[PDB]
RNA sequence: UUCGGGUCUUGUAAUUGGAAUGAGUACAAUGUAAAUACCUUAACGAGGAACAAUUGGAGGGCAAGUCUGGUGCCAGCAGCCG
């Protein structure tokens, strides 16, 4: 797979 | 461990090929 | 049967359809410019002393015509001429051939 | 006794039976159940009565240990004698020898399947199917067509069942009209049966007939509580206004046997 | 460089428009003025389920959680199981997934576990009958929403199988300028965990309101129990208005609470069904938004979908701008030639979209 | 790369669990393949 | 005449297998669909969906094979003597 | 095509050609027909008549040349109407992709005969409606509904309160339409109305099955001109966009200085829409062959010209077998005489699209062999591959 | 059909010599209403005589090559890919 979700919340 | 993966994944694209081709030669007649 | 062919759409408009661009595509030398002054003059009655880039002339009562000389010496010419070119105008050396 | 061996008449059986999920389906007579396994797959609650034990507990083999298991219903003993559960679709194999008496249950059952996909030797298939002017109309159809339609989905030959019976039989498709039409069975069927001694006689000629004449006059004496040549000039004229004595029985539709009952309850006679 | 968005509305419709266009997007503002800002956990996962679906999608979300830029990938597809966080049932997932599934490289198997209805999103028999329907018209030839276990608020324990064979380059141009004549009313009563009384006394309920019409009305009864009813009892009712003439349906539905009366959900969702006739022109309200995003999506021709002045509100505005802002589409509108009815005819030009993940 | 041979089979909790339920499934229906007297 | 629908056999591994030869192929006279054979896999190449297709008659039931595609023989093509035009 | 015409011309007389040969030249172009191209016919293009820099000329001093230009291309529209909002994506043959700026419309500057006697030969410049609402996004919804006269993420739309509805269809009349001697004719008109409805389309020729094909097409496109010819000029240019035949202003911001610079009048400048496909950078899976009469054969990682859609240019091609369809194994060279899979990454585009590979496009490494080394055609897009190479290990 | 039998200047993937000639080019003449062509003919025109004959059919053989199946080393398929 190619692309992922950039989760930066705390 | 590696072992024991790759050859349930060899086994079923033999059986998905296998279930395609009576497929295929099933349309075909 | 030779009349059947795989259906497709046409999508010039109805009314008022663009000049149709005609490419005269040929080897250095084989006579492109005098071709288009020669079909100019004809169509139109005007000799054009010098020609560059596109010319679009009257052609009939209801039809259009553009005219591009291309590039002898450049291919990416040939290339992007050759995806928008509606007629092309072969031009080929009788005495050298191909 | 012959089994099936066609896999694509169990298969088109099944799809014309267009289970839904939600229904549940009535089998009769699975036997080696290869068209119940598929029912099974595409029916929330399968029902089976099988006459042989044998055969419920091999069918019991087939859905052995499967998921499908637990969905799936055995039941033993001849369909009549039991009380049959409810069920919304009824498609089965059953024996010629009972489909007779079969399809009038279920019709007679309340609350009867909306469609069933059943399988008749040829020549019944066309009674059941046989229409007013037809050369095979006959009482039998008559009744059945009144209560419900019937509809020929397909014909399976003989070769396909092993040991080839010799008749052919046909799978067919009834539909129970709800609400079934406000009649009374055995006045219909006391109509039907006077009328269809001969279908070729005209109705006429069967009420003359003088042991059934007798049968008329009791049962118009009967309703008094509720003069035999007074009864046969009541049915003499009766007959004459519906204009029914003339026509042959086989010619006459559906409708007009209702202007032949109509007239009589008028005069006040009822068959039955 | 983004295409700028406010707020949490039309959250999903946002996204999956941006999927299928392929212009990248950016929403801001997301819940910023609330207690607990950025996004809920089911939009989160909603998300989450667009990644698996897609390929070299990138989804960025804020340190605050109340903005998001999005990147979308090509349609891929493939066999996935997605659970549903207990905030949204199945349908809230399963419904944007319809919009997308009929243009991807590989057929949709996603297997949708959590709770299986709720009030305010589709349930399944809503998607089964009364969304499916409408995309077999514009040519998803098969399509299926299998319910291997229902799972009724709040414990859920249902489970639901999204199969779509059918992959087409584009939906079909869409030609339908008169009001269908819908031939008969169907429907389904389904009820887990509970006795089967409660649905005999709400279809009782739905004929008594449907008893004086003039089409026959005939309603499932699906009763739910043992192992495949979920955890927790609970009953709902479907009433479709189905026109077997050009195979148009028209669709309401409610779920009962605990201590409600089945006999007044039935009578309710009756009259509710009725409304909704008279609202509708060629589909329901709530079908509208998917029939007008097929026929953006179709070829570069126009396409007439007849709507009724009713189906004209709040909601129908907002899906037009953001269409437009993504799609750069506008919905012409203009009256029909009638005078009995005050309809008016939605004239849509497609973006010639074409199905490019599939292989050849 | 490629293996000449079966990989020897390894007993998971999920195997003993399908293994041990088939021991007790067929324990309902008593058929044990016996030998018995002839 | 036809369309090219599908290569029946396309992903089938044996190599020059009978399945690879075979083309679904729609008759545009009438649009019944029907099976047409190709000389050989390398001919299976020239030939892609949505091609013109000239039949002619010829695994049983397939009685038709491929003689030209877009109006160019294939033997020609296969033997490399001219280009198809697209 | 076999029978193809061929003109022959003998000699130039005054830089023209013999009148005769010319005479029968300009009637076969003035008869022509032209077949519909897949491409052409999906794409919006048009070929610039004129160029002109709109750069300020004091912008130009106070930062200099360098400074990216503001030019405008006039040219008639082709293909595909062009649409009329900015901001659509095109492509410039040799110099790169941009976005219009803006888009006007201007009178046909050399207007044919019959055009023209409906309302100069030769032109070589180089040589409260609601619909309103519902686009004012000034105006907010819940406004534009009262004048004329809550989100998505609810499926159920708002139903009134439980009680009113029980009232408002205590009575089934108002939707009685929705559903299903002299008095006889009634009877049996409403019957046959009834008849049509039921049983109606399945019962509602063409002789070949082609045939019927040209009429579904055809007539949609008659529904297509009807529809817009009822629409006001404005409302039309604002749907379908600029058609082709329109003269088209065309301005362009952030194009290199260079080509401002670097304009050759007799260089043409192509200009071709991009479909959204076209913008996607990825791996191109692709179906590939040596050209027969190119001399060698073609390496893996070597740099090859494509020319896919509008766009030229250079890339690492793989070349790949399937290896009796068991994986993508990498090759070393293309084969002598057959096609093989190819991968390489540059602008996806939609399949079955045609194109050709060449390698050397500047005229110094000319020499005289032919230039056109591979032709294809794409079979797939994706965003990764797996490709493969055999590695043995070697042991006594 | 195995068993074998019948027969004698055969084979070369080897070298090498000078004689003939028209397809073609071409002074000219003939031919023709005027031309082209034919028949003629000064002068050129052959060794890969590259001055480069085609359309079909049958049958091999090869690999540190690739796929499938299994009472080991095999068999089937096939092999422009090592
Ligand atoms: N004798 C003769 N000369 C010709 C003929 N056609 C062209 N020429 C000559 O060829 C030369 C080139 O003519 P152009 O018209 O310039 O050809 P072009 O294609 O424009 O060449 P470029 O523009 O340089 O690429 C001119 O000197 C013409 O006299 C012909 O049929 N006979
Ligand atoms: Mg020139």
Redesign the interface.
């Known amino acids: 797979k190619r692309g992922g979700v950039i989760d930066k919340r705390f | 461990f590696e072992?024991?993966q790759?050859?349930e994944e060899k086994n079923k694209e033999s059986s998905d090929?296998h279930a395609?081709?009576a497929h295929?030669?099933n349309?075909?007649? | 049967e030779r009349k059947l062919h795989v259906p497709m759409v046409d999508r010039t408009p109805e009314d008022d359809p663009p000049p149709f661009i005609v490419a005269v595509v040929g080897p250095p030398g084989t006579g492109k410019t005098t071709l288009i002054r020669s079909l100019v003059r004809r169509m139109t009655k005007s000799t054009l002393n010098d020609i560059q880039g596109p010319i679009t002339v009257v052609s009939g009562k209801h039809r259009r015509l553009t005219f591009l000389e291309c590039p002898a010496d450049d291919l990416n010419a040939m290339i992007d001429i050759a995806k928008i070119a509606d007629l092309v105008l072969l031009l080929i050396d009788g005495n050298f051939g191909f | 006794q012959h089994i099936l061996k066609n896999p694509l008449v169990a298969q088109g059986i099944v799809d014309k039976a267009q289970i839904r999920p939600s229904d549940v389906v009535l089998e009769v007579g699975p036997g080696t159940g290869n068209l119940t396994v598929r029912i099974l797959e595409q029916a929330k609650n399968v029902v089976a009565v099988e006459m042989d034990p044998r055969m419920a507990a091999e069918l019991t083999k087939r859905v052995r240990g499967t998921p499908v298991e637990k969905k799936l219903e055995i039941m033993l003993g001849d369909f009549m004698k039991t009380e049959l559960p409810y069920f919304d679709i009824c498609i089965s194999n059953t024996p010629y020898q009972i489909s007779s008496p079969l399809v009038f249950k279920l019709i007679n059952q309340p609350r009867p399947p909306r469609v069933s996909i059943l399988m008749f030797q040829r020549e019944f298939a066309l009674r059941l199917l046989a229409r007013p002017g037809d050369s095979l109309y006959c009482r039998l159809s008559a009744n059945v067509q009144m209560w419900a339609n019937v509809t020929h989905i397909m014909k399976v030959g003989k070769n396909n069942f092993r040991p080839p019976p010799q008749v052919e039989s046909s799978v067919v498709r009834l539909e129970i009209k709800n609400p079934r039409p406000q009649v009374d069975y055995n006045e219909w069927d006391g109509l039907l049966r006077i009328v269809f001694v001969r279908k070729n006689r005209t109705i006429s000629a069967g009420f003359k007939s003088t042991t059934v004449m007798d049968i008329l006059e009791k049962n118009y004496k009967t309703f008094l509580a509720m003069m035999h040549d007074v009864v046969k000039e009541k049915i003499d004229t009766v007959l004459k206004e519906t204009d029914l004595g003339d026509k042959r029985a086989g010619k006459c539709d559906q409708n007009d046997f209702l202007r032949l009952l109509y007239a009589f309850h008028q005069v006040g006679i009822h068959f039955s | 460089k983004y295409t700028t968005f406010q707020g949490s509305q039309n959250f999903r419709l946002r996204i999956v428009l941006a999927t299928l266009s392929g212009k990248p997007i950016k929403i801001e503002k997301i819940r910023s003025g609330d207690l607990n800002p950025g996004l809920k956990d089911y939009e989160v996962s909603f998300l989450r389920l667009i990644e698996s679906v897609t390929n070299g999608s990138v989804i960025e979300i804020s340190y605050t959680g109340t903005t998001v830029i999005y990147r979308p990938g090509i349609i891929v597809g493939g066999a996935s199981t997605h659970i549903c966080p207990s905030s949204k049932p199945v349908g809230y997932f399963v419904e944007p997934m319809l919009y997308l599934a009929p243009f991807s490289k590989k057929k949709f198997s996603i297997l949708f576990k959590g709770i299986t209805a709720s009030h305010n999103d589709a349930g399944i028999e809503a998607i089964k009958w009364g969304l499916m329907p409408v995309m077999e018209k514009f040519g998803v030839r098969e399509c299926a929403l299998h319910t291997l276990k229902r799972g009724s608020p709040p414990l859920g324990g249902g489970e639901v199988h999204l199969v779509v064979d059918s992959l087409i380059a584009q939906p079909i141009t869409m030609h339908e300028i008169d009001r269908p004549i819908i031939s008969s009313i169907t429907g389904v009563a389904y009820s887990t965990r509970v006795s089967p009384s409660l649905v005999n006394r709400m279809i009782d309920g739905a004929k008594k309101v449907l008893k004086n019409l003039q089409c026959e009305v005939n309603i499932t009864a699906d009763v739910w129990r043992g192992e495949n009813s979920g955890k927790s009892p609970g009953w709902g009712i479907t009433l479709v208005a189905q026109s077997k003439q050009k195979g148009w349906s028209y669709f309401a539905e409610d779920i009962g609470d605990a201590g409600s009366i089945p006999e007044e959900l039935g009578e309710k969702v009756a009259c509710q069904l009725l409304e909704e006739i008279s609202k509708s022109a060629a589909v329901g309200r709530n079908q509208l938004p998917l029939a007008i995003v097929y026929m953006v999506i179709g070829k570069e021709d126009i396409g007439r979908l007849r709507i009724n002045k009713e189906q004209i509100d709040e909601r129908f505005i907002i899906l037009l701008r953001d269409i437009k802002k993504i799609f750069n589409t506008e919905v012409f509108l203009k009256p029909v030639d009638e005078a009995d009815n005050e309809d008016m005819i939605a004239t849509i030009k497609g973006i010639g979209f074409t199905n490019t993940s599939k292989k050849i | 790369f490629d293996?000449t041979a079966?990989?020897v089979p390894?007993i998971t909790s999920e195997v003993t669990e399908s293994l041990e339920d088939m021991i007790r499934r067929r324990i309902q229906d008593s058929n044990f393949d016996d030998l018995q007297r002839r | 005449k036809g369309i090219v629908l599908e290569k029946?056999?396309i992903?089938?591994?044996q190599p020059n297998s009978a399945?690879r030869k075979?083309v679904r192929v729609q008759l545009i006279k009438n649009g019944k669909k029907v099976?047409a054979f190709v000389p050989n896999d390398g001919c299976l190449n020239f030939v892609d969906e949505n091609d013109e297709v000239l039949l002619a008659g010829f695994?049983?039931?397939?009685r038709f094979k491929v003689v030209k595609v877009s109006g160019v023989s294939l033997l020609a093509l296969w033997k490399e003597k001219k280009e198809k035009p697209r | 095509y076999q029978g193809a015409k061929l003109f022959y011309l003998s000699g130039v007389i005054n830089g023209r050609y013999p009148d005769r040969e010319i005479l029968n030249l300009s009637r076969f172009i003035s008869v022509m027909k032209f077949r519909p191209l897949k491409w052409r016919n999906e794409h919006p293009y048009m070929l610039a008549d004129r160029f002109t820099d709109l750069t300020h000329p004091e912008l130009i001093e106070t930062q200099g040349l360098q400074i990216d230009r503001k030019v405008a291309i006039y040219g008639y529209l082709h293909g595909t109407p062009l649409p009329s909002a900015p901001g659509t994506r095109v492509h410039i043959a040799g110099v790169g992709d941009f976005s219009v700026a803006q888009i006007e419309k201007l009178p046909d500057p050399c207007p044919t005969p019959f055009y023209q006697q409906k309302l100069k030969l030769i032109y070589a410049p180089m040589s409260w409606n609601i619909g309103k609402l519902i686009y004012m996004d000034n105006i907010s919804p819940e406004e534009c509904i009262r004048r004329w006269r809550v989100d998505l993420e609810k499926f159920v739309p708002y139903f009134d309160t439980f009680e009113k509805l029980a009232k408002k269809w205590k009575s089934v009349d108002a939707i009685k339409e929705r559903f299903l001697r002299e008095m006889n004719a009634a009877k049996k008109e409403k019957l046959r109305a009834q008849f049509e409805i039921e049983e109606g389309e399945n019962f509602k020729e063409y002789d070949t099955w082609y045939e019927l094909q040209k009429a579904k097409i055809s007539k949609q496109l008659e529904i297509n001109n009807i529809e817009y010819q009822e629409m006001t000029p404005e409302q039309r240019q604002r749907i379908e966009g600029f058609k082709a035949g329109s003269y088209v202003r065309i301005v362009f911001e952030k194009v290199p200085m260079e080509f401002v610079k670097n304009f050759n009048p007799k260089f043409p400048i192509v200009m071709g829409g991009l479909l959204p496909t076209e913008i996607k950078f990825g791996i191109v899976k692709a179906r590939l062959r040596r050209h027969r009469w190119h001399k060698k054969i073609l390496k893996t990682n070597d740099p090859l010209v494509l020319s896919l859609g509008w766009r030229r240019f250079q890339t690492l091609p793989i070349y790949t077998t399937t290896d009796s369809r068991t994986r993508t194994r990498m090759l070393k060279y293309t084969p002598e005489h057959t096609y093989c899979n190819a991968a390489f990454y540059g602008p996806l585009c939609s399949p079955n699209t045609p194109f050709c590979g060449v390698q050397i496009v500047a005229n110094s490494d000319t020499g005289n062999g032919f230039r056109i080394a591979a032709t294809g055609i794409v079979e797939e897009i994706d965003v990764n591959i797996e490709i493969v190479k055999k590695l043995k290990l070697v042991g006594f």
Request: some cysteine; glycine content about 8%; hydrophobic content about 40%.
């Open positions: 072992a024991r790759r050859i090929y395609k081709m295929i030669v349309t075909i007649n | 293996r079966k990989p390894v | 029946l056999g992903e089938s591994k399945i075979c099976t695994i049983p039931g397939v």
